[PDB]
């Protein structure tokens, strides 16, 4: 029972088939890897992407260069909705097939979708507030996010 609850406080933790101590009921709550800090204070998140950043010195301060493929994947439900609403797809499965085929009008829908939809750009060590900032996306034919030089 002690091992089940804590697998410590009893001199020697009991190990499994491998030589590694069994993870106890208490070990799944405490620590840097416990529920509180790995799953409750921070999380993995949908509608998110990541890519290398280039400069793009033509940008205005309020906008960022977003790759077209990245935008197409990040805004898929919005694209399905626009495809259904504008009559270009009868059902959601048909709209999915169009977005998979990347038909010419899917890109027009994607331009309409992100016209004034900001996206949050975040760099890995978020030391302060300005480590996350919202930008207006401008679609770029590439694979690297373009970041304004002043940010």
């Amino acid at each position: 029972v002690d091992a089940l609850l804590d697998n410590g406080r009893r001199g020697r933790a009991i190990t499994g088939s491998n030589k590694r101590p069994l993870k106890s009921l208490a070990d799944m709550i405490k620590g840097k890897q416990g529920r509180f800090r790995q799953n409750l204070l921070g999380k993995r998140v949908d509608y998110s992407g990541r890519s290398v950043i280039t400069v793009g010195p033509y940008l205005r301060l309020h906008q960022c260069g977003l790759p077209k493929k990245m935008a197409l994947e990040l805004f898929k439900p919005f694209i399905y909705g626009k495809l259904e609403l504008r009559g270009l797809a009868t059902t959601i499965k048909a709209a999915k097939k169009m977005v998979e085929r990347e038909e010419a009008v899917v890109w027009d829908i994607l331009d309409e979708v992100i016209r004034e939809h900001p996206v949050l750009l975040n760099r890995a060590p978020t030391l302060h507030r300005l480590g996350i900032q919202a930008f207006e996306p401008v679609l770029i034919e590439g694979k690297a996010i373009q970041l304004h030089p002043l940010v």
Binding site: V52, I53, T54, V55, K69, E100, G142, A144
Partner: protein
């Protein structure tokens, strides 16, 4: 080659077994993209032997990092070679010199913020000459196992995919060699048995309306990862000892057997007969012996794709002095700085 090196490039190139180095001096007798044959000089010839050396070059194979390992001959026909000379150039080697990158005409100047923090501005001629292009062979395995509902199959009959999607697959359900595939195409067509689907209402009705039948097999075909686009350069089939081989497995096996005989027969012709024939029966038995696979897995098909990554913004470049950099823009040749002679950087 490094236009500016330190003189240590030959040592690194040769000491690492990435090139083919002459074991014995002689005159090159036959050169080919795939092999070199040397007529050893009589001084280095042992009494009981034929003075012939055959170096078999490593053609396009995959490295631990999914790069291209390929050896090209660096000698011409009839050329004299001495012991320790480089006969083929391995990956990233030029005439026995370590050649990790490309020597490029670089200018140091700001140019409009397109190299702002560490960004790099590149000309379109750099892309046109394909001098930072790389080959990226990669494996993709389709394993058919023994499931409780029934064994998995690699048939070419795949529900819910049209005629065109199955055009790249042969009769046995495996993509052809040399076929240029795109992210999403089927490589190996596989189907798993299924049952007791438990269809919902307003779907039973739909199937009734369209007189369609729900398939008893679900599609588990190996498809190309989205984004990746290369050509199929190799296919390997591993069949369990008891299972019966398919058409493509038998076809591959015959190709390997003929290749084996060809290599052994050429070896005897270029150069002993007792070891030739004994090795042909061992090589033949090894080709058809049947593979010891994991338990349950019935048949494995490995497809090797060969991508070609050219260059683009976001790719990291570097010099040898710790100067990193990500390509930001690829410039037209008429936008680049140029000197009095009109040569752009």
């Amino acid at each position: 080659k490094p236009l500016v090196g330190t003189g240590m490039e030959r040592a690194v190139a040769v000491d690492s077994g990435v090139t083919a180095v002459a074991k014995r001096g002689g005159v090159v007798q036959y050169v080919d993209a795939s092999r070199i044959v040397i007529k050893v000089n009589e001084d280095e010839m042992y009494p009981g032997e034929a003075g012939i050396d055959i170096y078999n070059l490593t053609k396009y194979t995959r490295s631990n990092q999914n790069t291209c390992i390929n050896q090209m001959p660096c000698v011409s026909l009839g050329e004299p070679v001495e012991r320790g000379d480089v006969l083929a150039d391995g990956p990233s080697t030029d005439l026995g010199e370590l050649a990790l990158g490309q020597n490029m005409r670089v200018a140091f100047m700001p140019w409009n913020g397109y190299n702002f923090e560490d960004s790099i501005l590149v000309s379109e001629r750099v892309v046109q000459e394909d001098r930072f292009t790389t080959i990226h062979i990669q494996e993709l395995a389709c394993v058919s196992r023994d499931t409780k509902l029934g064994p998995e199959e690699i048939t070419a009959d795949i529900p819910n995919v049209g005629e065109a999607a199955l055009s790249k697959l042969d009769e046995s359900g495996i993509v052809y060699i040399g076929a240029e595939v795109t992210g999403g195409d089927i490589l190996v067509g596989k189907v798993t048995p299924k049952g007791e689907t438990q269809l919902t209402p307003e779907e039973k009705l739909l199937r009734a309306i369209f007189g369609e039948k729900a398939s008893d097999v679900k599609d588990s075909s190996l498809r190309v990862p989205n984004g990746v686009s290369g050509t199929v350069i190799d296919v390997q089939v591993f069949t369990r000892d008891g299972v019966e081989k398919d058409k493509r497995a038998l076809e591959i096996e015959e190709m390997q057997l003929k290749q084996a005989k060809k290599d052994l027969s050429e070896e005897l012709q270029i150069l002993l007969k007792h070891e030739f024939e004994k090795k042909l029966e061992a090589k033949r038995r090894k080709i058809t012996q049947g593979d010891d696979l994991a338990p349950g897995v019935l048949k494995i098909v490995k497809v090797y794709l060969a991508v070609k990554r050219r260059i683009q913004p976001g790719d990291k470049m570097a010099g040898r002095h710790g100067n990193k950099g990500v390509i930001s823009k690829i410039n037209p040749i008429e936008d680049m700085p140029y000197d009095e002679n009109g040569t752009p950087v």
